[PDB]
Specification:
The protein contains 3 helices and 4 strands. The chain is α+β, with helices and mostly antiparallel strands and 119 residues long.
Length: 119
């Protein structure tokens, strides 16, 4: 199972966004296509698409932005033929920062949507 392989494209499971943006950049097409191909052939595989944001803005606002980012990925996967029974788009907002810095570099690491495969 390439999902356990660290040298497979399936190892990359994060989509990053620009400030205040929930648009899936073109550079993530290959990543989404690959995961789409894997999920479609493994219909028993479920994933949570977890949207995240940087600290700027209110919690309420970022909770919404985080959801928009997760759903942008989800729609991308849906468009590629992934079943609606395999995906759930959720938002963590700015609750769970992965980088604690207060700079552009740290913030960029928090504007993210994760493909989290369930057991």
């Amino acid at each position: 199972d390439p999902l356990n392989d660290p040298n497979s494209p399936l190892a990359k499971r994060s989509v990053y966004f620009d400030f205040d943006s929930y648009s899936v950049q073109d550079q993530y097409q290959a990543l989404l296509q690959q995961h789409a191909q894997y999920l479609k052939s493994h219909p028993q595989r479920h994933i949570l698409i977890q949207g995240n944001t940087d600290e700027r803005g209110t919690s309420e606002y970022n909770l919404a932005l985080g959801q928009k980012r997760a759903e942008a990925v989800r729609r991308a996967l849906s468009l590629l033929g992934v079943g609606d029974a395999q995906m759930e788009a959720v938002s963590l907002g700015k609750e769970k920062p992965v980088a604690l810095g207060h700079d552009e570099a740290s913030w960029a690491q928090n504007r993210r949507a994760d493909l989290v495969y369930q057991q």
